[PDB]
Amino acid sequence: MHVAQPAVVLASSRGIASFVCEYAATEVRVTVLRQQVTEVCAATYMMGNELTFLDDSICTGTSSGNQVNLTIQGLRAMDTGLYICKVELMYPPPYYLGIGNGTQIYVIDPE
């Protein structure tokens, strides 16, 4: 497969960073990593519906073919880092695991 996302992005003054992660059949699952390397948030969504991410999570995504707009919230200075956007292609088979090189989110700068 092949996941690619924005080269670089800069969160707003309130802590809202939103990039566009796109992959190359209907129930996809984007897992947001972070470079150690740990899990920020994740979800499973149909072809073109709103993502979920539990409910107490810090992400909010929408999607529509090839890509999905993610939006991490409540970010701060220390958060800044390479946020890798992984994309798995679940049911229906065949599987497919594509990983991006991550978009660098620069937030080191609170109010």
Partner: protein, 109 residues
């Protein structure tokens, strides 16, 4: 895992899975695919859907819910390849992969 079968005979592609959190094929989804991301058999939430089964595998496989394996019948001289078993756990939160094992298939002519 490498397993040999003879031409026109059958082959047993194990999934190697070993249910830990004891689950039924209902709250799970199981399929197998080859070196080309094609599909052999699929066991959806308990049933067996062929909606996305490749022609070459259709009508020549069978699930053995017992050993989580999968017999592939009437072997050809093309089946000689690499197959992988996968199992997702369709939770409410969404399907998550929980297992994936590979196997090599040598068809002795």
């Amino acid at each position: 895992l490498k397993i040999q079968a003879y031409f026109n005979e059958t082959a047993d592609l194990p999934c190697q899975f070993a249910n830990s959190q004891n689950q039924s094929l209902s709250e799970l989804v199981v399929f197998w695919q080859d070196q080309e991301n094609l599909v052999l058999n699929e066991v959806y939430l308990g049933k067996e859907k062929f909606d996305s089964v490749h022609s070459k595998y259709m009508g020549r496989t069978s699930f053995d819910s017992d050993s989580w394996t999968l017999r592939l019948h009437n072997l050809q001289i093309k089946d000689k390849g690499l197959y992988q078993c996968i199992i997702h756990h369709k939770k409410p939160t969404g399907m998550i992969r929980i297992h994936q094992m590979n196997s090599e298939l040598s068809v002795l002519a």
